[PDB]
Design an enzyme around this catalytic site. Sequence first.
Site, PDB file in Angstrom:
ATOM      1  N   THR B 819       0.524  -1.170   0.287  1.00 50.70           N
ATOM      2  CA  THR B 819       0.056  -0.303   0.001  1.00 50.70           C
ATOM      3  C   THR B 819       0.635   1.291  -0.113  1.00 50.70           C
ATOM      4  OG1 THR B 819      -2.044  -1.341   0.984  1.00 50.70           O
ATOM      5  CG2 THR B 819      -1.889   1.459   1.376  1.00 50.70           C
ATOM      6  N   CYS B 820       2.232   1.910   1.252  1.00 55.08           N
ATOM      7  CA  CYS B 820       2.502   2.986   1.160  1.00 55.08           C
ATOM      8  C   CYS B 820       4.173   2.610   0.315  1.00 55.08           C
ATOM      9  CB  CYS B 820       2.864   2.927   2.691  1.00 55.08           C
ATOM     10  SG  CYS B 820       4.043   4.517   2.824  1.00 55.08           S
ATOM     11  N   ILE B 821       4.453   1.455  -0.250  1.00 54.14           N
ATOM     12  CA  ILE B 821       4.570   1.479  -1.290  1.00 54.14           C
ATOM     13  C   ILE B 821       4.039   1.986  -3.026  1.00 54.14           C
ATOM     14  CG2 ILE B 821       6.061  -0.548  -3.123  1.00 54.14           C
ATOM     15  CD1 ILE B 821       6.642   0.293  -0.644  1.00 54.14           C
TER      16      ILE B 821
END
Lengths: 845, 845
Positions: B819-821
């Site tokens: 996700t935060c990637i």
Amino acid sequence: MERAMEQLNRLTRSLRRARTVELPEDNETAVYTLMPMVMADQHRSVSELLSNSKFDVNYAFGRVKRSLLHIAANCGSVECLVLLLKKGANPNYQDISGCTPLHLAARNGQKKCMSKLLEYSADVNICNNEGLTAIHWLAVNGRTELLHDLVQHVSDVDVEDAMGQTALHVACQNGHKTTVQCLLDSGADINRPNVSGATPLYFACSHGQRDTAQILLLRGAKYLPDKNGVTPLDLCVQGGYGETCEVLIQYHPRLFQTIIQMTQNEDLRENMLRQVLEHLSQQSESQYLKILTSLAEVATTNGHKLLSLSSNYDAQMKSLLRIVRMFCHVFRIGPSSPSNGIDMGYNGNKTPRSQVFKPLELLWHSLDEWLVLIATELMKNKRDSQDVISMTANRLSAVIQAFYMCCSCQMPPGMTSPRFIEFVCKHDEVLKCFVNRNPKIIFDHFHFLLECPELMSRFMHIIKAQPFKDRCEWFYEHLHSGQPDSDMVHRPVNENDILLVHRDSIFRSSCEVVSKANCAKLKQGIAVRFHGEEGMGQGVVREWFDILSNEIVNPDYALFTQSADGTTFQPNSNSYVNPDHLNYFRFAGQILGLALNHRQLVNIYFTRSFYKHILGIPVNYQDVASIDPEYAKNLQWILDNDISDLGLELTFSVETDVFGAMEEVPLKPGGGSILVTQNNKAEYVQLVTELRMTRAIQPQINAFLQGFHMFIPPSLIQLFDEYELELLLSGMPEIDVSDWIKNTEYTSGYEREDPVIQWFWEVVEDITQEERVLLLQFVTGSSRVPHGGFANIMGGSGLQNFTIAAVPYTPNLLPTSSTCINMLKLPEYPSKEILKDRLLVALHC
Amino acid sequence: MERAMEQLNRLTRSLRRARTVELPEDNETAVYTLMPMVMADQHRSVSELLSNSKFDVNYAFGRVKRSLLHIAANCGSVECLVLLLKKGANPNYQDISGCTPLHLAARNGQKKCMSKLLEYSADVNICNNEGLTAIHWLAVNGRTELLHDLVQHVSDVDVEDAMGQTALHVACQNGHKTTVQCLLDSGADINRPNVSGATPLYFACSHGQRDTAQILLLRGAKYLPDKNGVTPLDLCVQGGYGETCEVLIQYHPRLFQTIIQMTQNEDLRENMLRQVLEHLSQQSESQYLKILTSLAEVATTNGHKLLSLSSNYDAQMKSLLRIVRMFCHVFRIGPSSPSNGIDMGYNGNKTPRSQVFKPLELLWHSLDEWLVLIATELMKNKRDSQDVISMTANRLSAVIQAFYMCCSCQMPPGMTSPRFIEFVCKHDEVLKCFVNRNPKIIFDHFHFLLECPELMSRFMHIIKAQPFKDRCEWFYEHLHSGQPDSDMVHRPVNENDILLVHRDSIFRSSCEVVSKANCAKLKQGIAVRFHGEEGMGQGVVREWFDILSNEIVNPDYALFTQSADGTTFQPNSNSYVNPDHLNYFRFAGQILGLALNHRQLVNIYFTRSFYKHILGIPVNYQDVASIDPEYAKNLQWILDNDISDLGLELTFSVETDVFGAMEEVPLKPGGGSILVTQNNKAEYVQLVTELRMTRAIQPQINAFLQGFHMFIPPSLIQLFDEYELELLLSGMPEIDVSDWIKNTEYTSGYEREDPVIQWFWEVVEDITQEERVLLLQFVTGSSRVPHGGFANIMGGSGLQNFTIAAVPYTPNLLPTSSTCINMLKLPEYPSKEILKDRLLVALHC
């Protein structure tokens, strides 16, 4: 190999709760875990695996670009703080606002950080780009303990904002103790001039910090003005607080005289001086004397110097009052004790009066030295009566105002000294001679000399001595001013200037409303409401009165009646039947009391007796005529005759046929035991009249006024004549000379063919409206012609238009207007110039 | 000669006080002196010289044209009254309003005048042209004594207005005693039909005069309807007063059943029936039983008759509720005593339950007789599943609503009977089969069957049994309604919907404001003010929130932090440092609680954990990933492995390195005394998570909700999904597929040349916005693209636009979004239809 998991195999087993791996390869990640843990105060956790890392602290974060080293300022992470400083750092960074962790520790109150930071060091003498230093940051906050615990590290007390303020300059601007003693102990500078030359002391005299100032002058703090030249002391005035001056004066008794000089000036709002003098006066008796004494000398000086003729009328005069007005006010609070106000216990004093009042006595003697001559000058100027006279009069007018002010305070409330009167006894001539010149004036200088009825108890005198013709445009002043007394020229305001009426029963309802409110809320052109409905402001107000313009004179409560004329009213004597009537009479005058203050007419007018009983007059003889002609007509015949002629006597007790009882009642105790003297003929019947009034008028009249005087004080009205009075109840009339010409009735075998009538009209058609309106009521009593004009006159009973009556009535005598006959009776003058000249003698009176 | 003065020579001597001459030669003059003296009650004075006169009394005065003989009505001048009647008069004149002195004496309460007038006489049977008679004038006023003292003179009790009303008809319309007994003693008519046929009694049943009615039915007064046909009794209803009925029923017990018939009707505001039944229920126990018993029979009847299929859905159904709703309400007040309400002292009863509830039992048995078949019908309809089904369902839906109503009152507050559950146990199939047809419905019939959590404590069940796809436009109902629960669709009003904010410290100031007010005043779109300044209504309201949209997430009180993503927030665990924080958390939810009720977004959004802890969910595993990847990434590796593989165990007590202490703390008591089982691998870490929460979340979370639930009750929200939830905090997004196409990143040696990407876009560009928005957050977590579009994405740290990732990840498995990637990882499907079909299987879940 996979042995890289082995470090985590320990982490999971026993350290996964506390920690992660320190290999994310981003310094931004390190803050994303440490930023809490720093604030967690996890003393050693931060180090544990951080022992391996490649991320230095000089990298920072946020739009502030702030390191965790700053963040450690917040929660007291002294151990981590050191752990950071094992790694090294430059704490006094170029932070965005010139700040530093040190400032931020102070704001967060972490003592040990400040200590341990300063077991290391970085220069504190740095400042914010907003201005402050660490030390200044603490001064405003007054953060004593750390600040005392701080000085050991630092060298200079010459620390300053770039603006130049020292910590010293702050702590009194803010007000605080401890910052003083430390720097005093440090040896700072006490005068330490600002860029503007100001001093630490200079702040306090703006502030009110009496106690520090007690320490500083004790400490030897110097007094001196601004670089501009103003003093500290001018500020402690405008701070209003006086013990701070009292502290000041223990160190400088010399300046006590300066306040006497500060009051001569006029830059100030005078009221602040009262705050000071009020206090100090209550700080000794011996003060209290010397104060007043000194003031009178100033007053005495400026008094003479107002008579130094070159003085402008503005300068000396205003200086004077400002001394006197307080001087009056001070005596109200009165003879002080040492350290305290008014001397309690003993109501007398230690004989101050001569010591305090002597400077006056010379001025008043000096006044007398002028005035006594001045009477000679204008009076001796007998053949021939710019005006230095009017000039010097004005100068003295101020002084004349003093003579009430100086005098009207050592007496109980309202009462005057006869000493005042003795002054009038000598100077009565000159006093007339001013108003002879100054009609324009009374409400400025004399305003109160009138106002006292106890002085008007004589000075009715000069009120008549100035005759009628001057009163006209000042009869108008009460209109085109408010009433020119300032409380009445002025209208207050309040948050709720609203009254709520109940619409179907306004007569009793309004009594329930207006009784439920207080004067000051009502002394205003207040808006009005219906009960549960709006009323369009002025609209309901018009409705409310003009309905009451009916309700009042409707026989709604058995209250009024019509007088014998009709087309007017007088109160019913029988309204004592129903006891609430007085509540309505009080109510009645209140309602009218508004009507004149805000100056819209009422759709009512009344007879003459009623105006007279209001305005305070003893009703004359001839006013009787409106009650019953058959009474008055025959009393007139008695006024020709005397006891010698008529062969009859009045029983001085007569059947008071009232309340269903022929109550045999005397004229008077003592009056009942005499017979008619010839002098008595009008004199008892006056008493019969007043006793024809007293049975119903006396209680009811007082009730009416007491409701009325709420909205005008009784004494403003003393100008007015009762005839002119109604004009504010009804507005000026459209002088309808046109329709008047149309319906002039004539009698005695009499029509405009008579040159007397030609001579009549020839005089009438040049008369001012100020006299035509009088003549209209002089012969009708009532005033208003109906809406269509003079043709609408109905006579009450039978359309008797006005009649002009000339008869062989002697030319040696004056008219009498047969009023409800709508007629004026006149003598036939022999010739034109006799008519044109002597008809004036007949009509003006 | 002049001897004409001799009469006056007596007058002056002894009678001038009391009297004048009676020779003015105008009758109008005579009134101008007498009109007072009449009112003076000067008994004989009026006669004294009036002995000579030529003026008769038949001449009158005023615009009324009223004689003094009328005037004597006022003050009781009986002697003068006679003196007038020595002169003669026709007292019942044609006065302007048909009045007469007699009426006017009554109004003025002069007894003897009425007597002495009626020692003479003039016909009383006359009336006003306004309608009234003398006797009617007295009846309304209730002027008893004179009225009883009056009847002796007069013949008829058939006296009536021309409209026809008798005195009798008045006194009960007004309410009064004495007028009854006199006319009863006189022998008047008790029914005495009006022109409209109404009766004296008919008034009282509009009125409430119980006591007269107690006398009249005692007296034998008849009962009967109107000429129109309505009853008296329908009025005593709408008068609301019931003892008057209780009086009535002592005389007519027969009618008790009629009220049971009056309630079947629907002409009424039902509430009035409650007033009656509330009272009567408290007038006996034996009543209280028979009441409820009778009601159930009606209910039972109408119940069957709702199943009389021809009955319209409207008629029977509404009749029902109105019985049941009271029936529920009555039991709240509960088992009455004789003459009194609820049985005091003894909390039990005399075993009413079967006697009162049996008619239900047949209906519910009857219900069961249908429903049990009905399950067979629809279930057995197996090959093939208008709609009589949906029709009959609706009919029963009302009954289904009853089954809560009948049941939910003999139990303590809020709690249910398992008897309800037993009903569900048999009929669960059919119950699903309705909502299978009726998605549209719940807030009408079922509205409360949901509302109970204790029923939702199972009936969570059917809330899931209806899957997601139906919830969309009713997820919208909470928007385009209010919340469709009527208290929330509705907004109250109050006289002061105003709050005053202090502008420079809104974060703490608003806490000082909103704590100082109560819920009901605030459950509204209330306007807002500054402290001492206006704010243009909605303007300051926008300012006030959107400032708080900063203040809340500013580190202003050390309160929140950003989560690992950045561009979002989560509460700081360390906010327990400063104890007022809970006051801010309670405050926090209140402020948000308004934001959704009146439906303007906030300029904030939060992570997933926070929504989940609010909405009541146990947070899952994978939500962990936003806390630290290095934690979550390695736990994922553990989810492949078991205790058999990893060669490691969790110490079930680990260093709780918090508050500067490596606090050795167990997983759980009992949990600390075990080793890892293979099943436990996710199960303890769930508990580690919850225990990673509890240290700061548990107290603070509750404080937040308790402020929040003020403005929405907790249970309305049970529809919502947490992903969709933010849309009311942020509004729908501009779906920026355009700028999204512009900056699609690609990895795995990967660019749109790959047909997989061609197959990808080919599916994407037909997707509903209801799923595109999910995918956006599914892979970003955060939602909003910045103002310029999708190109503005910054990744928090480094402008990582979104990336599409396909890999040789097995086709047998579903995605996971790194996700935060800003990335979504996907398997490479072999072929198009496999991609086009199975990528759906991958993405929807």
